[PDB]
Design a protein around this ligand. Structure first.
Ligand SMILES: CC(C)(C)NC[C@H](O)COc1cccc2c1CC(C#N)=N2
Length: 276
């Protein structure tokens, strides 16, 4: 009855994720002084994290603790698609924030005169449309099915919701959803770091964004490294370890609100907003 021990723990992780990310979104939405363009992009992140806390983790927990999928074959597919979507939209929004800040530091005047709150809302829309496309459509079309009997048995069993995929899908989805935006985020972030260094409160706020980026990479990159090792040698990566690395990724959705707590502007605004 580690089954009940884990059930309660999982419900608290949900709470933390969901409450933290609601708090961030409520701070941004109730403080005019905190509605920078950047923070509009942060809104998108907190939303992806919020969908993780409300939909992805709760259904995931049930799989983890009971060891079977209870929610039918269609919700198995939908759950998986929304999980994959949240991760994709998160890393694409982080790579947009890296690029945005690189242009903000190298051309502050131009940038502030020609990005607006509406033009950001459009970028964000695009991101979620691309995310949804690369996530939902391949899953819906069953492009991810493998031909091995083990795989086929899982797909015919409504009670199996392991993302057992073919090699081609595993590689391609991982490149497109994660490895290329990660590589871009890192390349661009290092250039922002270079230019800041050349130039020397502004810099403390840039530091927070760097931390978010590094932490997101540490949380998700284990899973994505393992994803690739496993397409090459299926025996190499035990399932419980794969699952542990996936939960490290889910944990990222609890982390952002906590990191935002340490920005001084955000803190103040949370104090005000909460009758506190
Ligand atoms: C719902 C499942 C069980 C799937 N969760 C896996 C993880 O949360 C993130 O999943 C992914 C996100 C983006 C791209 C991906 C991916 C798993 C694979 C694969 N091959 N390609």
């Amino acid at each position: 009855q580690w089954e009940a021990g884990m059930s309660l723990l999982m419900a608290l992780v949900v709470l933390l994720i969901v409450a933290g990310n609601v708090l961030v979104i409520a701070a941004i939405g109730s403080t005019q002084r905190l509605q920078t363009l950047t923070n509009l992009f942060i809104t998108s992140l907190a939303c992806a994290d919020l969908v993780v806390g409300l939909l992805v983790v709760p259904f995931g927990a049930t799989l983890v603790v009971r060891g079977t999928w209870l929610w039918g074959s269609f919700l198995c597919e939908l759950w998986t698609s929304l999980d994959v979507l949240c991760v994709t939209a998160s890393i694409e929004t982080l790579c947009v924030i890296a690029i945005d800040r690189y242009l903000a530091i190298t051309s502050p005047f131009r940038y502030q005169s020609l990005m607006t709150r509406a033009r950001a809302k459009v970028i964000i829309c695009t991101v979620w449309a691309i995310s949804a496309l690369v996530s939902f459509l391949p899953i819906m079309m069953h492009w991810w099915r493998d031909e091995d009997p083990q795989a086929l048995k899982c797909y015919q069993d409504p009670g199996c919701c392991d993302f057992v995929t073919n090699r081609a899908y595993a590689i391609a989805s991982s490149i497109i959803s994660f490895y290329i935006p990660l590589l871009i985020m890192i390349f661009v972030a290092l250039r922002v770091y270079r230019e800041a260094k050349e130039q020397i409160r502004e810099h403390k706020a840039l530091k927070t964004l760097g931390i978010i980026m590094g932490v997101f990479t540490l949380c998700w990159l284990p899973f994505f490294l393992v994803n690739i090792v496993n397409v090459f040698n299926r025996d190499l990566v035990p399932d419980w370890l794969f699952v542990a690395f996936n939960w490290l990724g889910y944990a990222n959705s609890a982390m952002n609100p906590i990191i935002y707590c340490r920005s001084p502007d955000f803190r103040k605004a949370f104090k005000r907003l909460l009758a506190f």
